[PDB]
């Protein structure tokens, strides 16, 4: 152990993530290790490990040098299996090993995501401070311009820092939304208290519900404030039966993936194949809005669970998010 | 009572259905029979009959030589009383009699529908085969042109058969829906397990409900295949909030009644007077959909009947059709 060790290892793992590791130790590990030959390092007698492997083997896991969204029900599951290994390691010998072994044949997004969540929640990651996403995978936090300016630097082997950019809109209250600090927090908040947490993982995040209610209420408040300061008017509430008034162009790019799709202004909400129907929301919204109005949330049995009490708002945040 | 017999009386009955019977027996039965004096032929002591009669007498039954759709709540009820008589005869003397007695004063659709149903479920119709509707009442299964060609062969008495008809649509998968066999089947399937069946009539049809779910799912299935074969793409699902994209003109005619109305394309669903509001669907659709989602259907007392079991899909079909 140590930390200036654990730490070191981490830094190495997340170094030039888009390419096979250059740190020799990480690679003989990456090669010689077998997550299945001492089912003892694992507190599960390695059921986790044996499940990743099985996938890695039938090679039914997402490819490397490809994008990844945490909203993709499969990409998530895969990402989250790495979490589950890293998670039941008794000591560092087992983490390093895996987050090396996998690091090299699992996709980067799943991987970056997996490592962070794992470091954050696993028993074994106390000493560590995680590098800032913004510098680990800069395509998600940097402009598309600066990105290309950086690819040029590199082509020519000439160094230096480029100035990023952001009178026509409400990309006047932009400084708020595009800040690398908020973006960090926004992701961290949901890494700290993930929507996918099962108390099987080890403990129980306390009031994730009210936490959820509140955190957004404040982005939402903080946001409303800035627009105040900009002669702008408080934000419109979004409806599924209306047009999406204010659309934008992000001018942002994926590393592997392409450029973030843009949305024109005054658009009509389309039924999106694979996710869900527009109407599917409308009804959800109704079911929600009826719990609130009745006084109770009704479970699967037709058991009405009361929410006209203090535990109220979290039970509500459990069903809303 | 052979069946040869049984059978013969039945082809007699349904011969030249649009004009007074020409078979002399059926006639003088038609005239001298009294469905209510010897109410010992009825296993109901002629409750059945004494109701038809009453109607027949206050003259509030639907006229002859007029159309009839099985969807008309009255038209449906009258048709269905005939059913109730034929149904409580102890032997052929009683059917012959009524389907003769009634044949001659009761509307022809009521009458053709009443005799088949009766023939199909009454305990007294075993040996018979019913003639193919397509040849009993051919306006329903034949073109409007063919029909017309046929009125001319008859005005001039020179005989002859006509070829029916069916590059501009999806009346390219026509050969499927316009087939006299399908068509047969699709009506028979609903005569075998009728939507109006009360188990007071006699026995209980067994899984009408999954039977219902399943038969349509195979029309639909079968339907979807043919389109495949025609470079056409799978069928849109219909919504009450969008346009009826594809209308058609059936170029079909009724014998008494006129030409079947046509639907222009890209139409908007109108609230239709006497049947129900568009919205009315809209909420029934919701009501249904929530039963699917809750885990339970809820009766009129407010008792939730669970459908997350094998009797499941049938309970559902009983509230769906
Ligand atoms: Cu969030
Ligand atoms: Cu049908």
Tell me what portion of residues of chain A adopts beta-strand conformation: under 5%
Distance between the termini of chain A: 38 Å
Q: SS-based structural class of chain A?
A: mainly alpha
Number of domains of chain A: 2
Number of helices of chain A: 13
Helix content of chain A: 40-55%
Which oligomerization state do the chains in this entry correspond to? part of a larger assembly
- Largest interface here, residues on each chain? A-B, 7 and 8 residues
Per DSSP E runs of 2 or more residues, the count of β-strands of chain A stands at: 4
**What is the topology, as strand order, of the major beta sheet of chain A?**
1-2
Heteromolecules bound: copper (II) ion
Largest beta-sheet details of chain A = 2 strands, antiparallel
Order of helices and strands of chain A: HHHHHHHHHHHEEHEEH
Tell me, what's the shape of chain A?
globular
Rg calculated over all Cα atoms of chain A: 22 Å
In words, what does this structure look like?
The PDB classes it as oxygen transport. The structure is cut from a larger assembly and holds 2 copies of chain A (321 residues). Chain A is mainly alpha-helical and 321 residues long. Chain A has 2 domains: 1-165, no CATH class; 166-321, Di-copper center containing domain from catechol oxidase (di-copper center containing domain from catechol oxidase). The first copy, chain A, contains 13 helices and 4 strands. In chain A, strands 1-2 form a two-stranded antiparallel sheet. Chain A has a two-stranded antiparallel sheet with strand order 3-4. In chain A, strand 3 and strand 4 (304-306) form a beta hairpin. In chain A, helix 1 runs parallel beside helix 5 (92-101) and helix 2 crosses helix 5 (92-101). The structure holds copper (II) ion (2 copies). One copper (II) ion is lined by residues 186, 190 of chain B.
